[PDB]
UniProtKB/Swiss-Prot annotation:
EC number of the protein: 3.5.2.6
Gene behind this protein: OXA-48
Organism: Klebsiella pneumoniae
Effect noted on mutating S47A: Does not alter thermal stability
Name of this chain's protein: Beta-lactamase OXA-48
Active site: S47
Length: 242
């Protein structure tokens, strides 16, 4: 069952933005969104693709473990945190595209395509360049589809090893305190209109898990912090976090 709560639209309009938050209550098997249509509209995954990409790279042995160092190629890029060595943890944390582009090249088109279908991931379409299709190729995924995929990951039900799933969930660790744990991944899609920001993941409580997926219009990078801020305002309104 699904419920539309348009009162959450206030959290977007108060920031002169537009978007969708989708929440899934795992215990109750109930979903909630401010916009049922946009919850089911398909967008480029951008850096949220680093979740499936990490899983595939680990399961195939392209990445041995979360400590393996991916050396900076020495090419100066405009994101300072990218001009350094990374492991899986820091590459996820800083959304280090060029590390994940090399993963995709080593995975290759055929194995990437087979694995996205096994994951039931989005439209499963890797049309485009193997090292950029999640940024400007044919792949698309909706917020509700993000939740379906994340629920499988949470339960270790994806068709990769338990180990690969545990490592990726470790790499998704974003926040933890005495009240909750958030495992999540941001995305920022600018190469194909409409430009959007993503935040997808889940909130672990003592006695429940709340999965979430949001995207929002992102005409400039000035608003990127709103991805987490709007999501958390919704979580606070629904008494999921303090
Ligand atoms: Cl952890």
């Amino acid at each position: 069952e699904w419920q539309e709560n348009k009162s959450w639209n206030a959290h977007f309009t108060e920031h002169k933005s537009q978007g969708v938050v989708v929440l899934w209550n795992e215990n109750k098997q109930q979903g909630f969104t401010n916009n049922l249509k946009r919850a089911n509209q398909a967008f480029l995954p951008a850096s949220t693709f680093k979740i499936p990409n990490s899983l595939i790279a680990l399961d195939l042995g392209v990445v041995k473990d979360e400590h393996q160092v991916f050396k900076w190629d020495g090419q100066t890029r405009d994101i300072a945190t990218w001009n350094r060595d990374h492991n899986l943890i820091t590459a996820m944390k800083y959304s280090v595209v060029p590390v994940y582009q090399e993963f995709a090249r080593q995975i290759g088109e055929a194995r990437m395509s087979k694995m996205l279908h096994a994951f039931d991931y989005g439209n499963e379409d890797i049309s485009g360049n193997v090292d950029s299709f999640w940024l400007d190729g044919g792949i698309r995924i909706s917020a509700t589809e993000q939740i379906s995929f994340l629920r499988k990951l949470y339960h270790n039900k994806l068709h990769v090893s338990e180990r690969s799933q545990r490592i990726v969930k470790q790499a998704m660790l974003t926040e933890a305190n005495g009240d909750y744990i958030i495992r999540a991944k941001t995305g920022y899609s600018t190469r194909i209109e409409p430009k959007i920001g993503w935040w997808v993941g889940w909130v672990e409580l003592d006695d429940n898990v709340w999965f979430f997926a949001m995207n929002m219009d992102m005409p400039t990078s000035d608003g990127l912090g709103l991805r987490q801020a709007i999501t958390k305002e919704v979580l606070k309104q629904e008494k999921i976090i303090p």
